[PDB]
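ping. complex inputs:
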Amino acid sequence: EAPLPQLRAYTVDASWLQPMAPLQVADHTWQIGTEDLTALLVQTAEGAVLLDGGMPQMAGHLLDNMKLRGVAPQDLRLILLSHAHADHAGPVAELKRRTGAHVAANAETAVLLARGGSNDLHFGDGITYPPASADRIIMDGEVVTVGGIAFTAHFMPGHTPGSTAWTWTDTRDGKPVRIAYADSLSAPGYQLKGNPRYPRLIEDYKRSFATVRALPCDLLLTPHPGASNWNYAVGSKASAEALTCNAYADAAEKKFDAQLARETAG
Amino acid sequence: EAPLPQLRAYTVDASWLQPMAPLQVADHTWQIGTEDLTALLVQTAEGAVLLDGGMPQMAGHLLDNMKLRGVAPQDLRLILLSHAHADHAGPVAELKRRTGAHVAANAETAVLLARGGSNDLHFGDGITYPPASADRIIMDGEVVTVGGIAFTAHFMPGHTPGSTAWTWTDTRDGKPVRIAYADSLSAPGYQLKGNPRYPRLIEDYKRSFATVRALPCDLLLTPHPGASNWNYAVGSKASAEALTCNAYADAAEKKFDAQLARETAG
Amino acid sequence: EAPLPQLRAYTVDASWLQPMAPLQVADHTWQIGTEDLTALLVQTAEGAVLLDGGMPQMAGHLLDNMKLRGVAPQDLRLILLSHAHADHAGPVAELKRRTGAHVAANAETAVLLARGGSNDLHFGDGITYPPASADRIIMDGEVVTVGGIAFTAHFMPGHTPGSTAWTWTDTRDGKPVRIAYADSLSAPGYQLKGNPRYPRLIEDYKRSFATVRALPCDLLLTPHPGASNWNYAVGSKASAEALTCNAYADAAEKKFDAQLARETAG
Amino acid sequence: EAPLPQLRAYTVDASWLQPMAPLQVADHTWQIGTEDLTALLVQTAEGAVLLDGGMPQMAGHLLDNMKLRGVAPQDLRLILLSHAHADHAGPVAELKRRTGAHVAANAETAVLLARGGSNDLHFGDGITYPPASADRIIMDGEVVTVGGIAFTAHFMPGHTPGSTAWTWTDTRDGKPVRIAYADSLSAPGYQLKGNPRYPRLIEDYKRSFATVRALPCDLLLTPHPGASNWNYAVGSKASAEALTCNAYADAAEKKFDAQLARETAG
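pong. complex structure:
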């Protein structure tokens, strides 16, 4: 007599959905997402690059901020992703339609993006979003160049099989600033041990800690700004407490090792 | 200061989600969906065919009913669709994964199914579901045969560009029963006139009325049972008030012509 | 003892592969393909449109001709298709990779393009090419606009299920010139009657003749220039003997009706 | 005046295309491909598994051999792949269409298979084949079970990014036989050093040698039988000279290290 349950929406903290004006990270790099979701616009002489887009409903806000930066919709050349979950890749389909941008991603990110996050290794169908196609498949270490700005992929599987850190070198004053945009190193609610859908999950995480430790980095950013102790809401002091790559990886690994012991204990 | 709106789920009438035991339509054809969502199981000597699956959360109920009919998950050979909206194609992805079934559909249904109903001509991204791939592309009039039971496709564009009616001949007692499973002929909230995403919408609907009128049919069924005056909840009297194809098409066209005049008037 | 046969390549007349310099059709429209394969470049204030690309090996030649016209690879915004056979859509995948262009096509063209022409309704796997993805799905009559130039789709199924004629209005001197780029109306070696993979082939062809007859047209062009009596090799006299839409459709229908009678007779 | 070059077909040694009758490997495992292309049929109580299919033109021969083994087309449940090149995955699309089988593969194999081998990291578009879709995405170490026979994936990137070795335990007499079906460890004509499309090629090969060395294995087989010193043409003595996993990996690594030094020297 009880009916089947209704579908539930992917609802998130209001701060994840709180718009912010563009916040400059370096000479050509801007945070244009929300207070608690990173979306990085990199502006070049030959068009703009977007790294991540946040939630699906953020598409219009992203275009507004791009316009504030002098970037028309057609000027967006490329979208890069940390990972293909709804809260970071949510608006990619709409953005492609409205900009003509291409998406570059590794094969794992591509196949998750192409099914809109459904059949997730850990979340099933609970966190879906409009599917999008990857236009260029990226390999570990491959360099993607737009307007003379070179973006290098560093695979860091774990949070998703396709999780990627992206590095590039901007400037601030006249000195180079090596930026590292590293994916999450958390395993929120994952079954870590003997996971049939991810048998080498622990090995991949362990390797990804070491990958993040060794990234070329003067300024680390993360898809959730709090993961690297950014505070987008405080303007020019936003980066003041930012973690190093070593401190970020160290903290992730201690959190991981605890969760692993607590899984052995229940 | 107002955050972006949260995502909203596709919630439906409880009767759409009310499970029912299998209800026999003819010697090999059974309703195995819910009280207000049709899902037809056709059982052959060489496996079963499923026409439509209802909402995404109906996958487990469909498999339970199949099991009641003696059909193991692996015995489902083929899934056919009326149209690729979330309330009729919702569980197809999961069903493919759990059964090994193939999906046959026309090109329009295939491309909508492959994007999980996102970027709908009328509903945008408001009604998405897990994407699935079509294994065989069907043309208008093409015959799909499983276990000697021949299913013929009749394209009836309008409700969706890929909307399809499926016909086959079952038996009841020892007499043939030509079944027609016809898609919806409604345009719920659609902009009918000068729709940029569907410029020939009116012409297609007009043609589809005539297609439905001429279907070979002794027993009409529809994805929403109320559209053809079925009442699944009353057991063996469920078909008593069922419409003919002529009466179904007639009523749809009068509803369409009214909505069209009311669009000219606002 | 006989081994399986080797794969055979899709080889074509040398004139299909004979490069030509850009040939101006109207103020913004240029033939930039080969002597016997049409590829139309339309240049706008906000980027270029390419209608068809010919054979797969024509990608580099197309880019050379675009460069001659002042169009850098990144300036190509959009690719449109008459139909997704190897000799007209052959280089689309490579062109997308090298230009960032998006492809717009109807659902039938999209699914054939996505399987690289394999499992063709008539040719099987004999004429394959690198698959490409459609970025925007087009409906019959839908208008695609780039740089203020409006391209309208007119579906003309037959040669392929997704065959499309594209119309737009250019200028010559200061007078408008309605261009019609119409797909082939031939059925080369097709089984016309009772074709299981295309049961309504005859009806679609018959309707497509009438569609082509009624196209808005001052200048007709076709994917094979000889089909509309163009001669690309003679420069400014190339259009002199060009057919009207009526004469093109008339001739196609007489050819079709003959082939149909000869199929009844063997 | 010279026309563009014609397309060239992927032609291979006649022995790759020389049909053979089924050759028993263990109680449930049979070679059913050609003399020089492995295609392994594993027969279970609940349907058959095919590991690799060889060249595209081998589809009909594979079905003939399956029929010889008592496996009807519909009885093939699953296709697994070593890698998605035309000479081992060639007939997968046709096989899916004619059998209802599902394909399981890792994300890299899936994306290469989905573009029919086009845009290969090393071969470009020179070796294409009809694209096919993967129905289940596999992770490293994941177990796929059909009829109680468990197949484990072991990723061994290098020959292709998605190259996979598959292991399972059959029987011979009444003793277990751990079979290892390992992909190629060759780099035929690849640029090994500083390859922009595969920056970590050397690291992946180096790791894959060690993966192959440690596979659980009593009987090694390879997609090209000569790579592991099988001789399918000599019947029951076919396995006599077969390599161990250690000897196969050792020989591959010495070949790789030589080619690497010869690349430094030209």
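The two ends of chain C are 35 Å apart (CA to CA).
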